Amino acid sequence: AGKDCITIHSATFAWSQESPPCLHRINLTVPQGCLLAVVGPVGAGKSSLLSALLGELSKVEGFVSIEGAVAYVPQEAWVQNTSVVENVCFGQELDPPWLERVLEACALQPDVDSFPEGIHTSIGMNLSGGQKQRLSLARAVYRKAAVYLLDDPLAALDAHVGQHVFNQVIGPGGLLQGTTRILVTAALHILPQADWIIVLANGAIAEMGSYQELLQRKGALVCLLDQ
């Protein structure tokens, strides 16, 4: 097995110390460099799991350790009023070859070609929801982080663009192939591509295994697939 990257240790989280826990005694370590899929019904706490890893919740009990720099792509993206390149860079030092690669892998090169000033076009110009979401992911990919928390960033994108983005940045061999990716995803076509799958039920872990492990076993993942 691979290096321990993220360790979650007897960890219970809530929105405030006084609020009842929203995440119940998480006990899980994510190996380094793996694509882990977080899945479950709506309200199962998948979103809050990423927020807990960002330190945004009050930890009632337990310990959390993450190895390396952490990038985050929210579910609802939003861009600062700026040129395209300075949204992807976001204070990162500009690398024209690497920036082109990222905008490519995030399926943004047609669109920036379309713009009047290209990558220097201020937004400024109105952007679709898919464009903001891909620009958001590009910003995290550009950071060259070691851990990526992805809160279903490719949900609203249309299938081929969503395929384009997932294949090129998130999946096997993508731009983030050496990184540890925690991917919350309502979409279940990518699950054969993940190394590990985590299933959540009411803020707790119900199942964990590979795709066909959790398929042979007809339980929480298979119940969710037929839903």
**Domain CATH number, residue 141:** 3.40.50.300
In angstroms, the CA 73 to CA 150 distance is 5
In angstroms, the CA 191 to CA 213 distance is 12
Resolution in A: 2.9
Strand order through the sheet with 23-31: 23-31, 4-14, 58-66
Provide the experimental method for this PDB entry.
X-ray
114 is known to lie in a ligand binding site: no
Strand order through the sheet with 35-39: 70-73, 147-151, 180-184, 35-39, 196-201, 204-209
20 is known to lie in a ligand binding site: no
174 is known to lie in a ligand binding site: no
65 is known to lie in a ligand binding site: no
14 is known to lie in a ligand binding site: no
Q: How many domains does the chain have?
A: 1
Strand 58-66 to 70-73 pairing:
unpaired
The domain of 79 spans 1-227
Name every residue whose Cβ is closer than 8 Å to that of residue 129 and which is 6 or more positions away in sequence: 77, 156
> In terms of C-beta distances under 8 Å and separation of at least 24 residues, what long-range contacts does 219-222 make, across chains too?
220/40, 221/39, 221/191, 221/197
40 is known to lie in a ligand binding site: yes
